[PDB]
């Protein structure tokens, strides 16, 4: 049920791609050249993973879009953005990958 989503401009404009859709997810999905949004908005669990490479025009598009997921989709009001770099995630986090290690 959760989607994760790459942000990115590396491709020559800043992008939002859907990754995945299929539960749980790979942990190699994480590219440290970009940031991802992984949402799972209906329960108020929304992440930004900030890659280690990743630049700062990424970083700021990456929760602006989450903010904005939580609006266009209907998402419940009081929904925070969790924000992550690599490195620092969370068991809420790893929890929808497949064996983090
Ligand atoms: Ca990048």
Redesign the pocket.
Same mark, same amino acid.
């Given at each position: 049920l959760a989607k994760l989503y790459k942000v990115? *401009?590396?491709a020559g404009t800043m992008s939002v791609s859907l990754v995945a859709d299929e539960n749980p997810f790979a942990q190699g999905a994480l590219k440290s050249?970009?940031c991802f949004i992984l949402d799972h908005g209906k329960d108020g669990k929304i992440f930004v993973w900030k890659?280690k490479?990743? *630049?700062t025009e990424?970083r700021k598009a990456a929760l602006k879009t989450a903010s904005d997921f939580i609006t266009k989709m209907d998402y419940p009001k009081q929904t925070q953005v969790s924000v992550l770099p690599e490195g620092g995630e969370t068991p809420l986090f790893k929890q929808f990958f497949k064996n983090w290690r």
């Open positions: 990115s *401009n590396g050249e970009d890659g490479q990743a *630049n990424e």
